């Protein structure tokens, strides 16, 4: 933050660069930082809480103008809040087991596989066949640090998924690139490719 936030060369490359309005950010399927740079108050760890994000305390950085610089400050403050959550989880770590103790779902421990019979059958059948999943379609979405990472997983009832659609943030962000680079030069399109954190493994699948 000392090297880049106060620096005039960084602000001259990020203040006017790639401004995203609010309703167009909701419209193009932007998620996470691309919404939170545009002032949209949306974080999937606070709105639709999963595993124990209801039992940690952290803040959600909200942008002001939607440029590269406000999304930069959103990412820096999310590193701040990540240090906050890591301090809490290093203080609030409970004792217990690490797999679910339902042995038809998770494999058994090795000392209880090399002694017992049912756990040997379950180790054998979980690593050869696997567990059967009930038939049905789900859409499970998390807040990956880019945005909404989602899996639309349709299962037929067997041990192999029938369909696994992967909603990735960088796909919709690189879609919104076509609006975001209107009226800039070559030297700002590289900053727009930056501020949308485009990792092309999730864009291309």
């Amino acid at each position: 933050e000392e090297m880049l936030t106060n620096n005039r060369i960084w602000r001259n490359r990020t203040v006017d660069i790639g401004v995203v309005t609010a309703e167009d950010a909701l419209n193009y399927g932007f998620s996470g930082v691309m919404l939170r740079g545009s002032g949209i108050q949306w974080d999937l760890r606070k709105t639709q809480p999963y595993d124990v994000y209801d039992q940690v305390e952290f803040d959600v950085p909200i942008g002001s103008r939607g440029d590269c610089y406000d999304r930069y400050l959103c990412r820096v403050e999310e590193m701040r809040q990540s240090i906050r959550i890591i301090s809490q989880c290093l203080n609030k770590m409970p004792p217990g087991e690490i797999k679910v103790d339902d042995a038809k779902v998770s494999p058994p421990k090795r000392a209880e596989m090399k002694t017992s019979m049912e756990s040997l059958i379950h180790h054998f059948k979980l690593y050869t066949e696997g567990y059967q999943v009930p038939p049905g379609a789900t859409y499970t979405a998390i807040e990956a640090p880019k945005g909404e990472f989602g899996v639309y997983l349709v299962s037929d009832g067997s041990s192999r998924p029938y369909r696994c659609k992967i909603k990735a943030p960088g796909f919709a962000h690189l879609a919104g690139l076509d609006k975001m680079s209107k009226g800039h030069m070559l030297a700002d399109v590289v900053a727009i490719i930056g501020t949308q954190d485009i990792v092309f493994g999730e864009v291309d699948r």
């Binding site: 005039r8 950085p61 942008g63 090795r110």
Partner: protein, 176 residues
């Protein structure tokens, strides 16, 4: 539960306005950046002297594969093919037959190291700890077929690295 990044209305008295004008003309934050760079000039950099030093690892590390043996010479692979039923790359080719003393052993245990994803489902699915994914990561080659490990090369990795793999499993088998 939320905060506004970049919502600082600046001070507009003559003091802070003169301070920001001197900050613009006399380049204050540029000297701040130069000071931070010069402060990392005068440290000991974290460059380790490879290959006379090595990177830190842990006994869970997943590198070059190996087939282990009991402490009596007999090999551990009892040819039960879980490690090819769980191998996500399908990088393992197993064929077996009953040998001379009638024990269920392999005759083909191929691991294609250029298919293998080095995730260690084989070393955790093996019910006798036969296949292990050892600590060797410095096993790079110059020809593609040199990375198509058959049973002989995996037994040679096991016999070569057993003094290390047995100690790693001895240090790690209480967490699994």
């Amino acid at each position: 539960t939320y905060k506004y990044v970049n919502l600082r209305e600046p001070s507009m008295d003559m003091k802070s306005v003169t301070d920001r004008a001197a900050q613009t003309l006399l380049w204050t934050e540029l000297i701040r950046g130069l000071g931070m760079t010069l402060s990392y000039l005068f440290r000991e950099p974290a460059t380790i002297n490879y290959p006379f030093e090595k990177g830190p690892l842990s006994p869970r590390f997943r590198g070059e594969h190996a087939l282990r043996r009991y402490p009596s010479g007999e090999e551990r692979c009892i040819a039960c093919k879980l490690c090819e039923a769980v191998c996500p790359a399908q990088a393992i080719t197993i064929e077996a037959e009953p040998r001379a003393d009638g024990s269920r052993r392999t005759t083909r245990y191929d691991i294609d190291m250029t298919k293998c994803i080095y995730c260690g489902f084989c070393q955790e699915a093996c019910p006798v700890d036969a296949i292990v994914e050892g600590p060797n990561f410095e096993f790079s080659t110059e020809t593609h077929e040199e990375l198509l490990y058959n049973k002989e090369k995996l037994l040679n990795n096991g016999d070569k690295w057993e003094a290390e793999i047995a100690a790693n499993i001895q240090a790690d088998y209480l967490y699994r």
